[PDB]
Design a protein around this ligand. Structure first.
Ligand SMILES: Cc1cc2nc3c(=O)[nH]c(=O)nc-3n(C[C@H](O)[C@H](O)[C@H](O)COP(=O)(O)O)c2cc1C
Ligand code: SF4
Ligand code: SF4
Ligand code: SF4
Ligand code: SF4
Ligand code: SF4
Ligand code: FES
Ligand code: FES
Lengths: 208, 214, 439, 108, 91, 680, 78, 41
């Protein structure tokens, strides 16, 4: 027996596999790929034109009441052609389950706002807009929610620096908090924590 | 307590010379002429042992002389003479007593033989005497394992020993007298003792057991 | 083609003195050339080396002669690897001669008492594989044996039996000499290649074979003293007389030496597949204190696992019967151990021998053999937990098969046999030490 | 420090590698007798978050969380701790630190 | 070069040119006004990095293309050879 | 040579016969962990980490020495392979010292990364409380190598690199069993110009960089890719910069230039970047001594001396000068009415017009395929030692016969010394000499001529005749004419059109003599006139700055971005690792600012328009890393010992490590001479 | 998650949804957390605190200062 | 004894996620719910 290895839940595997084949059968227009990851989590990989009609479907069907939307997450992967991906995590209280709906979006290409489906997307879709520049069309008001009012740029992209571009200091000549180009007293020491030997042989050919 | 690195001992420095005797130079030439041309490095091991047939042990000057003969650098001779066990880089006395400690000799009481010789000479293992007369070292298998309690003194096998028998042998060797080799219990060579159970008959001559067509 | 004929004989126990290959084993006759000439040696050698190499290797394949130096690899198929045409490089027969396994002393006695059989077999095998030179690698311990062999080689040179025009046949064969200095790892085939080339120790890896690259970059075959010395008797007495002894696969005649805890130590020449109890009880006395006092036997040297009394009461001593009794034969060495002495100190002495005689190239054999020596020293002392035993078995499973030559295999085998057989002895000694240190 | 008196810190830099706010700056040279011990060990206590990862990542018991917390300063630069300030803190607080490490090492 | 592994080599990356780093006047720390000295961005091919650099308006240059293939043969039998200079002297 | 079918990790691959299992698995991506196999060394089995499980086999096979045959199924990720790797690796980790917090290879140790990747998670060694572990004495190797043999795992990478590539036989393994020790039997200095690579080749860290003793850690290092300018190879290096400090210099992988090796002068010159640096602009006062002067005052002083000279100015390039600095100097002198420029190391007359006169036209990657090479008055192991590594590889792998004309030199391999007479090379061009038949009978022959032999008065004559001999012996896609010039700036200066020879600027009698980073000392005050405003634009200035009147500072090769062209003609670009100390600037920026102060400014403002002007003057000087092959080309050695090799350049002269090396080598020389003379 | 299925407790549910029901739900959460605390002190097994995979968890300081693999894993994971 | 890391290796038993559309296609050569029904009323 192996007590240091997490045992997967089979009743969260079979139900999620049957539901993944079910949602692939019910929506062949938008759903490209459904996958059951390690850790018993189901991912649906939709087209960017199907953000609203998939998240509406999982909201209102009898066999899928994913009525709760917990978080909308943006991941910036600059290697890909469409660099941003947007992940909608949905919780189903009736069937006691979770789903993740992932789509790909570029900064210039807009995305459908899920605010008509779930009202939590009134704010979460602002936050990605504050941090990646993913424009969400047909939004109630798409404003800047977390960064400063005079901030220029989206900070959580991987092409943005860690320490930012500018700093703030009080100027007693102008009697106000002015903006200066960045000069750190001690620079950020970039540690080269790269593994020269591969440790996972199961992920060697997982890219095709 | 052997060392596999060399230090500047006054008795083991390369300052002291070592030249082959002209009687031994034809033996060196014959040993070089046994092995084929281009692969004379194979004459390395019957050369360094040949120094033990002249000097008694192996200094670093003998190593340099072997490397000068074979036209190769000193470190190959260093590593070859450091690997093998008979190339005693330490000083060694006139008689090098080797007592086997390994299991087919240990089963018939080689520990009593070792303790008897250590009481007779009064020295620890791997150490020579003050007058450079006797040298002891615990050693692995030598062969002739039918005669278990043996020792080896100056490449001579002294077999089938008893503690009283080896005490008599060491008393003969301390008074400069030679001692005969072989088993000490009246047995000539390796055989069952007392009865000729095998090879009792006369051996058949030529022409016996020849197959047809040869 | 050449095949070993079936035996169809039930009892392999008794023999006759006329079937002895080594008729001067004990040295009751003249060891020199006149004694060999009056003893039937050096007879019909010219026709044997004139009938061709294919006939000689077919005779060896028909007799079914296996290896006598520690492996069950048959000698005819090994000798057939050098019937291939040469690529401009010379061919070599190399006879290994170290017998540094403890308990192994038969071929030393053949050096001291039957050297012309070894020289004639060297000439016959060199004709059989096309070799024109013979290298025999004596240890530095065997100084009188090397002097006797050099005297016999000088007598054969003076008689014209070897050298240019060997036995009046136009075949050139010079039997050379080499004297190594105190290495048990020399004795392995590729180690002895590297020691003839002038390097130290250090066996080479397998897929460049000795038949491929060999000594001095030239193809060679490494053969035992006993196989070469019984080769003229096989080539003279036919391919079925040698196959009429032993079983079908294991046909031959082997020099068995019995050492340790017997009233008469023993170096007999005996038929293969003899029972062990009959072999001990017939000649050379027996176990001291009777057969009921016998604790265990080692059927080979330090490379083979031990077998206890109840296993060895019904052991047939060929290769295949010993493999069925879960121990290798290897070279022939019967170490007899009675109940008066502990097995643990003797197995620890064998592992200390393997620690002293490993060449240190391979890392499992350099490190884990010293580990097993430390654990066996604690097992002598008794200061170990019970768990270490099976963990020590794991160390054997991390050394056996993971090394370059079979010294790691030959050192992992007897601890495996000790853990398999005498485990309650270890538990009793360790419990005695625990009760000694607790109170 | 060791009981003999030599400083414990062998400049092995796991503490700076594990410091999440990156307060520790270590610069090391070989000393005259051949030791590895530091030439610069600075901890920015205005950057240090008092998380204790450095004492867990210390192979010897060199860096340690002392019992002192009444070390409020009048001036911002006085909280930039040098190697000499840390060595003086180790000299001053050695008894309580050694008692805590004696009473706490078997938990860690 | 002190390691034989190569799992951190196969990923292309873009980086920026080094700028002025100076000693701090107060303490011995190194200070830099360059915000982009610590930003290396990973890519799976050079052409995607070219597309990224032209899309973000950066002035780019390529340090060097990868080595296509080094054909090498490793034979154990060349260590022990006859009339060849590739024979080893040690083991 | 038909390929065979091998199923590795249940994946098909077609491999040519004779390849190892490790190569056949690295063809698809999976790598086997290794300790005693390097790609550039001989295969061996001193570790057993390469034990992989092939199907229908009783024992695991050593993947770095297994010639794979047709239809083997190799299972790298099997259970038996992982059990074998864990067992062999905990055997490797049994006697190894717990020195990781005091070991300089910690964080880049192969043993740590393979313990995380393939080893077990705990120890089963319960014998450390009693009978202990193995500890061995430290061996005495000189000031470049710190030796602690307790950490050694006995893989014989160092012994194989000494025996094959380095050519010295002083390293070996002594003893048997656990007591094998990988070191010299006696206290000897392992002296070699390629000794530093052994620190790269030790997989664990028994052998350690002694200048880089206890300085920093691998994760702390910022790695910047650049080139080395100390030797002629133009070897690609990676520089360890952390917090505005040069820590060490390591080899960078390129099969064409350096092949993962580095010379000792290339590697241990990082200590010379701290000593004798130029941090302030210095102007010679009328008192007689130089004083530190601000930048504007120094620039207007040099401008006033230029206006007082009136167009009689000249400039000499340096030993370590940048290509862009030489272009800026040439543009400043040509815009000020001076048509004379110079270089420290001379050359033949008329060789500037064709490139193949001054190139190592056979590739350094191609010199390992040579069959018979002739050295005309050069010692390649002290001038450019990676060329000697290529010649050593071609010596051991191909049946190569090499003859050298000149004095008695050691090449670390055997060679026939024809003599020190000059006219004997004419015998090589006569066909009557015995080596001429070997040269015409070779498949890929070559002739290498040193630059010091081309600087002598015979010179172009010896450059002409063997070129005719090259026109007698040529093969397709092979240019056998070769020249090896020690200065890294020489090939770039002759690319941009520098009149080679310092005597061309000496005989012009300059009122203001510009100097780049030139410390060879070929020009002095006695050859110069009574008044001569010597402006030295350099980084160190051990020599050539004491005679200067306006010592301007400069950045070293690790502190600025510029191009260097090596002896084969391949342009490469260095990168700025650290900032220049004090107020030192880049040399082309200094020359552009001086041109703006004088009144005739250069048109380029930044580096991009300077590269555009480089395209304007030579189209092959901007294709960095790409070599354009040229067409046909139409006795004493100053470097013959190691102590002559150590202090050739200015950075190597300012370094204390090279002085320590010469002190240790000379101490060993007097020790050996005293022990030899005490026996007489 | 993390032995919440081995403890027994009640869940406070409001009706009106105002601030008073949420306040009563929070104080009732404080009441039920006392009996979860009581069950956690009542049953507590004697065992290890960390997982024994030493490549994901730091080893003990005695194993770090005594054995080799634990020192290598301590070095790497820190 | 009997402790091997590969028998208890937690990190190396993680696989890439299974394509659920292709899993049916390569395995074929009461409505489905994502979980059990919980009554929250
Ligand atoms: C460590 C080791 C030591 C060996 N020592 C000897 C020895 O002393 N004598 C011997 O004949 N064979 C010895 N062998 C066996 C040889 O490798 C080889 O198999 C044999 O000598 C020739 O085989 P054959 O009898 O089939 O001709 C040894 C093998 C190993 C692994
Ligand atoms: S098994 Fe041991 S004795 Fe044999 S080669 Fe390997 S290292 Fe040498
Ligand atoms: S404080 Fe501790 S962890 Fe940090 S460098 Fe010093 S000894 Fe290492
Ligand atoms: S306690 Fe302070 S110095 Fe130590 S690791 Fe945490 S933040 Fe860094
Ligand atoms: S050589 Fe490697 S494993 Fe050994 S002490 Fe140094 S870093 Fe640790
Ligand atoms: S010193 Fe280093 S390179 Fe040499 S055998 Fe030991 S581990 Fe290998
Ligand atoms: S075991 Fe003692 S000589 Fe063989
Ligand atoms: S590197 Fe392959 S077995 Fe050592």
């Amino acid at each position: 027996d192996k007590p240091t290895v997490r045992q997967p839940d089979a009743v969260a595997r079979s139900h999620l596999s049957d539901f993944g084949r079910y949602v692939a059968e019910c929506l062949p227009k938008y759903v490209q790929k459904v996958q059951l990851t390690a850790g018993d989590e189901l991912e649906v990989l939709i087209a960017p034109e199907g953000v609203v009609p998939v998240l509406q479907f999982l909201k209102d069907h009898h066999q899928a009441q994913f009525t709760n939307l917990v978080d909308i997450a943006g991941v910036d992967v600059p290697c890909r052609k469409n660099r941003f991906e947007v992940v909608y995590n949905l919780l189903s209280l009736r069937y006691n389950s979770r789903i993740r709906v992932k789509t790909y979006t570029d900064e210039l290409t807009p995305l459908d706002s899920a605010c008509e489906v779930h009202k939590a997307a009134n704010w979460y879709e602002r936050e990605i807009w504050d941090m990646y520049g993913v424009f969400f069309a047909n939004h109630p008001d798409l404003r800047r929610i977390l960064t400063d009012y005079g901030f220029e740029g989206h900070p959580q992209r991987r092409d943005f620096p860690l320490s930012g571009y500018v700093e703030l200091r009080y100027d007693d000549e102008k009697k106000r908090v002015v903006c200066e180009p960045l000069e750190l007293a001690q620079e950020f020491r970039k540690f080269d924590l790269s593994a020269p030997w591969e440790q996972f042989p199961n992920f060697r050919n997982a890219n095709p | 307590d052997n060392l596999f690195v060399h230090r500047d001992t006054p008795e083991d420095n390369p300052n002291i010379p070592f030249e082959f005797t002209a009687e031994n130079k034809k033996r060196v030439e014959a040993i070089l002429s046994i092995y084929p041309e281009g692969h004379k490095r194979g004459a390395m091991i019957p050369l360094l042992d040949l120094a033990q047939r002249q000097y008694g042990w192996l200094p670093i000057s003998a190593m340099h002389k072997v490397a000068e003969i074979l036209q190769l650098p000193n470190m190959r001779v260093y590593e070859v003479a450091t690997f093998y066990t008979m190339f005693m880089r330490k000083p060694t006395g006139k008689y090098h007593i080797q007592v086997c400690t390994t299991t087919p000799c240990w089963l018939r009481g080689s520990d009593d033989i070792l303790e008897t010789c250590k009481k007779q000479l009064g020295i620890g293992v791997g150490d020579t005497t003050k007058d450079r007369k006797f040298t002891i070292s615990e050693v692995e298998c030598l062969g002739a394992c039918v005669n278990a309690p043996m020792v080896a003194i100056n490449d001579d096998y002294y077999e089938d020993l008893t503690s009283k028998d080896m005490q008599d042998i060491l008393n003969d060797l301390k008074a400069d007298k030679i001692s005969p080799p072989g088993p000490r219990n009246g047995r000539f060579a390796s055989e069952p003792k007392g009865e000729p159970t095998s090879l009792s008959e006369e051996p058949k001559g030529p022409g016996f057991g020849l197959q047809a067509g040869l | 083609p050449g095949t070993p004929p079936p035996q169809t004989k039930t009892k392999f126990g008794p023999l006759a003195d006329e079937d002895r290959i080594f008729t001067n084993l004990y040295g009751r006759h003249d060891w020199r050339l006149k004694g060999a000439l009056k003893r039937g040696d050096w007879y019909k050698t010219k026709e044997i080396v004139l009938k061709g190499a294919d006939w000689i290797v077919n005779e060896i394949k028909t007799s079914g002669l296996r290896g006598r130096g520690g492996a069950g690899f048959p000698s005819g198929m090994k000798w057939s690897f050098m019937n291939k045409p040469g690529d401009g490089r010379p061919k070599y027969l190399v006879v290994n001669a170290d017998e540094g396994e403890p308990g192994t002393c038969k071929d030393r006695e053949i050096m001291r008492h039957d050297p012309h059989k070894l020289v004639e077999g060297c000439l016959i095998a060199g004709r059989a594989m096309g070799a024109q030179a013979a290298y025999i690698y004596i240890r530095g311990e065997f100084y009188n044996e090397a002097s006797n062999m050099q005297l016999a080689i000088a007598e054969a040179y003076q008689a014209g039996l070897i050298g240019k025009n060997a036995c009046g046949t136009g075949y050139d064969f010079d039997v050379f000499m080499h004297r190594g200095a105190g290495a048990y790892i020399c004795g392995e085939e590729t180690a002895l290649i590297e020691s003839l080339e002038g390097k130290q120790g250090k066996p080479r890896l397998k897929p460049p074979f000795p038949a491929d690259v060999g000594v001095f970059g030239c193809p060679t075959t490494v053969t035992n003293v006993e196989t070469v010395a019984v080769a003229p008797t096989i080539c003279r007495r036919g391919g079925v007389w040698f196959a009429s002894f032993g079983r079908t696969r294991n046909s031959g005649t082997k020099l068995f030496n019995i050492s340790g805890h017997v009233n008469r130590p023993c170096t007999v020449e005996e038929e293969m597949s003899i029972p062990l109890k009959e072999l001990i009880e017939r000649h050379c006395g027996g176990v001291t204190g009777g057969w009921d006092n016998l604790l265990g036997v080692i059927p080979g040297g330090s490379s083979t696992p031990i077998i206890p009394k109840n296993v060895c009461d019904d052991v047939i001593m060929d290769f295949d019967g010993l493999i069925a009794a879960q121990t290798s034969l290897g070279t022939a060495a019967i170490i007899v151990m009675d109940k008066s002495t502990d097995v643990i100190k003797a197995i620890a002495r064998l592992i200390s021998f393997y620690k002293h005689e490993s060449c240190g190239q391979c890392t499992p054999c350099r490190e884990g053999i010293g580990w097993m020596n430390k654990i066996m020293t604690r097992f002598v002392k008794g200061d170990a937990q019970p768990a270490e035993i099976d963990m020590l078995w794991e160390i054997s499973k991390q050394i056996e098969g993971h090394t370059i030559c079979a010294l790691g295999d030959g050192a992992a085998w007897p601890v495996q046999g000790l853990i398999r057989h005498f485990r309650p002895e270890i538990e009793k000694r360790m419990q005695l030490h625990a009760k000694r240190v607790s109170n | 420090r060791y009981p003999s008196g030599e400083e414990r810190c062998i400049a092995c830099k796991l503490c700076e590698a594990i410091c999440p706010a990156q307060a520790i700056t270590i610069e090391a040279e070989e000393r005259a007798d051949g030791s590895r011990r530091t030439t610069r060990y600075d901890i920015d206590m205005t950057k240090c978050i008092y998380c204790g990862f450095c004492q867990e990542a210390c192979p010897v018991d060199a860096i340690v969380e002392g019992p002192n917390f009444e070390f409020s300063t009048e001036t911002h630069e006085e909280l930039l701790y040098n190697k000499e300030k840390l060595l003086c803190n180790g000299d001053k607080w050695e008894s309580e630190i050694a008692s805590n490490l004696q009473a706490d090492h078997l938990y860690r | 070069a002190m390691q034989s592994g190569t799992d951190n080599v196969n990923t292309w990356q873009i980086e920026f040119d080094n700028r002025e780093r100076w000693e701090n006047p107060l303490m011995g720390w190194a200070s830099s006004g360059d915000p982009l000295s610590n930003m290396n961005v990973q890519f799976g091919s050079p052409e995607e990095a070219i597309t990224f650099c032209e899309r973000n308006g950066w002035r780019w240059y390529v340090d060097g293309a990868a080595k296509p293939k080094k054909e090498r043969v490793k034979n154990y039998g060349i260590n022990f050879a006859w009339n060849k200079r590739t024979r080893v002297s040690t083991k | 040579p038909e390929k065979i079918e091998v199923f590795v990790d249940d994946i098909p691959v077609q491999v040519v016969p004779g390849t190892t299992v490790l190569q056949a698995a690295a063809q698809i991506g999976v790598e086997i962990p290794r300790f005693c196999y390097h790609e550039r060394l001989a295969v061996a089995g001193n570790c057993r980490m390469c034990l992989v499980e092939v199907e229908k086999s009783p024992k695991p096979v050593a993947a770095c020495a297994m010639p794979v045959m047709k239809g083997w199924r190799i299972k790298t990720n099997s259970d038996l392979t992982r059990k074998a790797r864990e067992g062999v690796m905990e055997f490797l980790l049994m006697n190894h010292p717990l020195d990781c917090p005091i070991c300089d290879q910690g964080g880049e140790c192969d043993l740590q990364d393979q313990a995380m990747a393939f080893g077990s998670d705990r120890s089963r060694f319960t014998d450390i409380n009693y009978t202990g572990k193995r500890a061995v004495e430290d061996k005495d190797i000189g000031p470049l190598v710190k030796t602690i043999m307790t950490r050694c795992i006995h893989c014989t990478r160092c012994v194989r690199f000494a025996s094959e590539i380095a050519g010295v036989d002083d390293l070996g393994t002594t003893g048997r069993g656990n007591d094998m020790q990988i070191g010299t039997y006696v206290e000897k200095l392992f002296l070699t110009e390629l000794s530093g690579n052994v620190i790269d080749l030790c997989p664990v860290g028994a052998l350690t960089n002694k200048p880089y003793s206890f300085v920093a850690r691998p994760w702390e290092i910022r790695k910047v890719s650049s080139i080395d300018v100390l030797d002629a190879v133009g070897s690609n290096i990676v520089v360890s910069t952390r917090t505005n400090e040069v820590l060490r210099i390591l080899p960078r992988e390129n099969e064409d230039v350096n092949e993962e090796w580095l010379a000792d002068k290339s590697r241990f010159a990082c200590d010379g970047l701290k000593r004798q640096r130029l941090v302030a602009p210095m102007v010679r006062m009328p008192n007689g001594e130089l004083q530190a002067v601000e930048w504007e005052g120094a620039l207007i002083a040099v401008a006033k001396a230029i206006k007082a000279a009136g167009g009689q100015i000249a400039g000499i390039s340096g030993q370590l000068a940048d290509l862009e600095a030489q272009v800026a100097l040439k543009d400043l002198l040509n815009r000020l009415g001076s048509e004379v420029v110079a270089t420290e190391q001379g050359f033949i007359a008329g060789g500037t017009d064709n490139r193949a006169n001054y190139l190592l036209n056979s590739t350094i990657a191609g010199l390992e395929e040579a069959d018979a090479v002739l050295l005309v008055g050069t010692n390649p192991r002290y001038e450019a030692p990676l060329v000697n590594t290529r010649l050593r590889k071609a010596y051991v792998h191909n049946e190569l016969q090499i003859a050298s004309i000149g004095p008695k030199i050691d090449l670390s391999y055997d060679h026939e010394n024809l003599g020190a007479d000059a006219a004997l090379v004419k015998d090589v061009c006569s066909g009557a000499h015995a080596f001429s038949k070997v040269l015409e009978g070779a498949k890929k022959p070559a002739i290498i001529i040193g630059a010091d032999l081309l600087e002598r008065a015979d010179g172009a004559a010896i450059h002409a005749t063997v070129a005719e001999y090259c026109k007698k012996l040529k093969k397709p896609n092979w240019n056998p004419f070769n020249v090896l010039q020690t200065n890294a700036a020489q090939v770039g200066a002759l690319d941009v059109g520098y009149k080679a020879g310092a005597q061309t600027a000496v005989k012009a009698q300059p009122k203001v003599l510009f100097l780049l980073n030139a410390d060879a000392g070929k020009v002095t005050r006695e050859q110069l006139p009574k008044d001569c405003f010597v402006v030295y634009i350099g980084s160190h200035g051990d020599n050539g700055a004491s005679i200067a009147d306006a010592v301007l500072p400069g950045a070293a090769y690790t502190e600025k971005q510029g191009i260097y062209v090596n002896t084969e003609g391949r342009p490469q670009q260095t990168l700025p690792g650290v900032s220049p100390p004090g107020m030192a600037r880049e040399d082309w920026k200094i020359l552009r600012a001086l041109s703006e102060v004088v009144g005739k400014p250069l048109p380029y403002d930044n580096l991009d328009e300077l590269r555009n002007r480089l395209e304007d003057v030579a189209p092959h000087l901007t294709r960095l890393g790409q070599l354009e092959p040229a067409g046909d080309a139409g006795i004493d050695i100053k470097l013959k010992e190691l102590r002559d090799y150590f202090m050739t350049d200015a950075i190597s002269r300012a370094s204390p490590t090279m002085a320590k090396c010469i002190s240790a080598v000379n101490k060993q020389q007097r020790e050996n001479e005293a022990k030899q003379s005490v026996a007489i | 998650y993390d032995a919440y299925n081995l403890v027994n407790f009640d869940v406070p549910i409001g009706t009106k949804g105002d601030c008073y029901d949420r306040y009563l739900c929070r104080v009732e959460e404080m009441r039920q957390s006392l009996r979860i605390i009581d069950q956690c002190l009542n049953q507590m097994p004697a065992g290890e605190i960390k997982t024994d995979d030493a490549k994901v968890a730091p080893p003990s300081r005695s194993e770090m200062k005594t054995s080799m693999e634990a020192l290598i894993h301590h070095f790497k994971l820190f | 004894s009997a402790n091997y890391y590969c028998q208890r290796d937690g990190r190396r038993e993680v696989l890439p996620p299974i394509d659920l559309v292709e899993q049916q296609k390569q395995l074929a050569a009461k409505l489905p719910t994502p979980g059990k029904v919980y009554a929250w009323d």
